[PDB]
């Protein structure tokens, strides 16, 4: 059983396996975003929208962890060296936009439609961000 566990641990820590797992999760998240923007939403979010919100929140926590686990000591230098990549800047802008849209959506009308609109502009961004996977 020990060689089987060694094979499992060696497979799941490979960078190609991690990349394909990230790619499949991103494609599934994008598909769920498509379902929650095409179909109507009620007063409370559905299960698919809760999965999309969880994806956004955990991605934001992961980007914060990438900010904290960097090379400089002083925090402004870590923020500056993380914002030197344009994709990190657009990721931060999109996560803040999703937060604003979800806050507006969790209220009543007419703010729910505003959150829906912000969701549509964000799905434009994530569809463009598929080129990171294509890279």
């Amino acid at each position: 059983l020990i060689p089987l566990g060694r094979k499992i641990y060696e497979f799941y820590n490979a960078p190609i396996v991690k990349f394909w797992f990230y790619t499949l999760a991103y494609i599934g998240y994008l598909m769920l975003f498509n379902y929650i923007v095409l179909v109507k939403m009620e007063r409370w979010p559905s299960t698919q929208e809760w999965i999309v919100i969880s994806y956004i929140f955990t991605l934001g926590i992961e980007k914060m962890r990438e900010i904290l686990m960097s090379e400089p000591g002083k925090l402004l230098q870590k923020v500056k060296v993380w914002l030197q990549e344009y994709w990190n800047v657009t990721d931060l802008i999109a996560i803040l936009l999703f937060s604003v849209g979800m806050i507006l959506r969790l209220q009543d009308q007419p703010f729910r439609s505003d959150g829906r609109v912000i969701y549509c502009v964000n799905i434009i961004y994530w569809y463009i961000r598929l080129l990171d996977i294509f890279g």
Binding site: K40, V117, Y127, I128, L130, L131
Partner: protein
């Protein structure tokens, strides 16, 4: 079998791969504009396969000179007959349509022109030589 048509045919077959990569990038941009337009203009929809059709329908014919000009920004919320009320954020649909049409028709088609043009000579020489090779098989 013809000395000019044959290498032309396999040259078309060689540029099919560059056309395929172009189709992949156009599929990404087209699907973004279709999803955004359908999701803004139609908020209250049941789960139906017509939504998937409406993702692809109008943005695809927008590449070939049909912008569907009556549906860019139709007058709404106005007595003219009081036209139906405007949906929220419907002004973003012509803006993202402008960005989509610009990116598609001006960037990706011209980029496919450029990659067809700069790889033409090697493909033409290899296609002529491979046709002269396949004369034996014929």
């Amino acid at each position: 079998v013809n000395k000019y048509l044959g290498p032309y045919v396999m040259m078309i077959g060689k540029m099919m791969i560059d056309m395929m990569y172009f189709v992949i990038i156009m599929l990404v941009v087209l699907m973004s504009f279709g999803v955004a337009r359908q999701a803004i203009l139609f908020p209250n929809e049941e789960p139906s396969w017509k939504l998937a059709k409406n993702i692809f329908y109008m943005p695809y014919w927008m590449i070939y000179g049909e912008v569907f000009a009556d549906q860019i920004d139709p007058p709404c919320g106005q007595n003219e007959i009081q036209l139906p009320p405007c949906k929220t954020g419907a002004w973003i649909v012509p803006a993202i349509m402008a960005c989509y049409l610009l990116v598609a028709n001006i960037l990706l088609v011209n980029l496919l022109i450029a990659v067809f043009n700069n790889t033409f000579f090697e493909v033409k020489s290899i296609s002529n030589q491979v046709w002269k090779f396949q004369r034996y098989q014929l």
